[PDB]
Amino acid sequence: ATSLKQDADDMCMICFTEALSAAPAIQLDCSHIFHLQCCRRVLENRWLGPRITFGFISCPICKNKINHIVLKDLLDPIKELYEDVRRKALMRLEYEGLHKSEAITTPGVRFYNDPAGYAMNRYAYYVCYKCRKAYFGGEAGDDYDPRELICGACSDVSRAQMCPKHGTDFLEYKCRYCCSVAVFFCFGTTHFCNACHDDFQRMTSIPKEELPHCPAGPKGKQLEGTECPLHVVHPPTGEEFALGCGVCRNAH
Ligand SMILES: [Zn+2]
Ligand SMILES: [Zn+2]
Ligand SMILES: [Zn+2]
Ligand SMILES: [Zn+2]
Ligand SMILES: [Zn+2]
Ligand SMILES: [Zn+2]
């Protein structure tokens, strides 16, 4: 009968190729045992891909959070980042008026009475290369350049007007090529959403007057209707545009 119960002679379920007995091992709070150095490397290496996520801290066996006293030096800065993203995500959800969504208010569902968890799941945050702050990159591998994840404040090509409440703390730009929030800033000049960035050769090559007009989907998609997915008036597709304060924009 196939069981995930650990044996003395088992392989480490991070590295797979060496026995737990072959190098120093720790017993995590969840009860599972791993090499010390493997646990350390996992916490150093963090998440896969540009979006800030926290699945990497899951025990490979039971998926509970990895925790041990000797890992506190690596876990502390992760916890700090977690709390910063969670705080920002929740605030964005509240300012969007989405914190009483049915996915939060219905007893028994995954995010019941957990608006901050809902928001972390809903929204994609990124680390700004320049200021090191987590920034919002829209609603949700390692073949990317971390130096091209830059927040709106740090890529402020239009010298946008300040938010009276927030300054530039939540300043965001659109994708140059579609009605989406920017993730990447390339060439020192150009904002891209993730999808347009994936097709950046084609997108930068399309003659400007042939780009889709608002409402524009990524990768040159002409959407139907006359309502901008960003709910703002903006210049023609193919021009940079500061969306202003990402939390105040909703209302303003
Ligand atoms: Zn190992
Ligand atoms: Zn475990
Ligand atoms: Zn920044
Ligand atoms: Zn785009
Ligand atoms: Zn638009
Ligand atoms: Zn604001």
Indicate which CATH number applies to the domain containing 60: 3.30.40
Q: Please state, in angstroms and rounded to a whole number, the distance separating the CA atoms of residues 87 and 185.
A: 25
Instruction: Establish whether 128 is an annotated binding residue.
Output: yes
- Measured from the alpha carbon of residue 196, the closest ligand is 4
Which structure tokens are listed for 80?
A: 């700090």
**Pair (245, 147) in one structural domain:** yes
Task: Return phi, psi of residue 149, to 5°.
Answer: -90, 105
Q: Please state, in angstroms and rounded to a whole number, the distance separating the CA atoms of residues 159 and 107.
A: 46
Long-range contacts of 95-99 (CB under 8 A, 24+ apart): 95/247, 95/248, 95/250, 95/251, 96/250, 97/250, 98/122
In a domain, 9, yes or no: no
Q: Which residues surround ligand 5, an ion (CB under 5 A)?
A: 179, 214, 228
In a domain, 87, yes or no: no
6 CA to centre of ligand 4 in angstroms? 47
- Measured from the alpha carbon of residue 195, the closest ligand is 4
Given a contact cutoff of 8 angstroms between Cβ atoms, the answer to whether 42 and 65 are in contact is: no
Residue 240 belongs to what domain range? 143-252
In a domain, 109, yes or no: no
Which structure tokens are listed for 237?
A: 């597709």
- Measured from the alpha carbon of residue 17, the closest ligand is 1
**244 DSSP 8-state letter:** E
Run of H or E residues at 94: helix 72-95
Q: Please state, in angstroms and rounded to a whole number, the distance separating the CA atoms of residues 197 and 175.
A: 9
Q: Which residues surround ligand 6, an ion (CB under 5 A)?
A: 163, 165-166, 245, 248
Cβ neighbour number for residue 38 with a 10 Å cutoff: 20
Active-site pick, 13, 186, 206, 223: 186
In a domain, 226, yes or no: yes
How many CA atoms are closer than 13 Å to the CA of 12, on its beta-carbon side? 21
Q: Please state, in angstroms and rounded to a whole number, the distance separating the CA atoms of residues 63 and 131.
A: 32
Residue where one domain finishes, among candidates 53, 75, 97: 75
**Pair (59, 155) in one structural domain:** no
Q: Please state, in angstroms and rounded to a whole number, the distance separating the CA atoms of residues 248 and 161.
A: 13
**Pair (54, 152) in one structural domain:** no
Q: How far is CA 230 from CA 100, 179, 236, in A?
A: 21, 6, 14
Cβ neighbour number for residue 91 with a 10 Å cutoff: 17
In the chain, what are the helix, strand and coil shares in percent, each to the nearest 5?
30, 15, 55
Give the strand pairing for 190-192 and 123-127: unpaired
Instruction: Establish whether 248 is an annotated binding residue.
Output: yes
In a domain, 152, yes or no: yes
In a domain, 102, yes or no: no
Residue where one domain finishes, among candidates 75, 92, 120: 75
In a domain, 12, yes or no: no
Q: How would you label 44-72 residue by residue, b for 16+ Cβ within 10 Å and e otherwise?
A: eebeeebbbbbeebebebeeeebebeebe
Instruction: Establish whether 39 is an annotated binding residue.
Output: no
Residue where one domain finishes, among candidates 28, 47, 75: 75
Given a contact cutoff of 8 angstroms between Cβ atoms, the answer to whether 180 and 198 are in contact is: no
The string of DSSP letters for 136-192 reads: EEEE----S-GGGB--TGGG-TT-PPPBTTTBTTTEEEB-TTSSSB--EEETTTEEE
Q: Which residues is 123 bridged to in the sheet?
A: 139
In a domain, 100, yes or no: no
Given a contact cutoff of 8 angstroms between Cβ atoms, the answer to whether 45 and 141 are in contact is: no
Q: Please state, in angstroms and rounded to a whole number, the distance separating the CA atoms of residues 69 and 203.
A: 49
Task: Return phi, psi of residue 172, to 5°.
Answer: -135, 150
Number of separate domains in the chain: 2
Residues 6 or more apart whose CB falls under 8 angstroms from that of 76 comprise none
Tell me if residue 39 is catalytic.
Answer: no
Q: How far is CA 60 from CA 4, 42, 51, 139, in A?
A: 11, 11, 21, 27
Q: Solved by what technique?
A: X-ray
Given a contact cutoff of 8 angstroms between Cβ atoms, the answer to whether 54 and 46 are in contact is: no
- Stated in angstroms to one decimal place, the resolution of this structure is 1.8
